[PDB]
């Protein structure tokens, strides 16, 4: 634990980016995260939505 | 823009619906503004025959 404010630093940082790039498999609401599936299941008026 | 078409075709006659003449005589953008005016005419559009 000597070198413990730099370590610190270093797993903000790589948690922060990982909490990012994991927020993306949130649908928020939507019927799925994956914009390819809304692309491919329903029509543009609702896929909108 | 005027036409005539069956009593159960006048919903589709609206942005973001699906349907028969929707999609091949007949399409409204999704972002359309304006009125749609039906009005029936049986005792004009008709023959017994």
Redesign the interface.
Known sequence: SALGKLQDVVNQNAQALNTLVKQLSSNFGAISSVLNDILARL????A?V | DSFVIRGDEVRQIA??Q?GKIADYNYKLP?DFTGCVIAWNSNNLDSKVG
Do not use: A, I, S, Y
Request: charged letters at 45%; proline letters at 33%; hydrophobic letters at 0%.
């Open positions: 029509d543009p008026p609702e909108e | 942005p973001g699906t999704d």
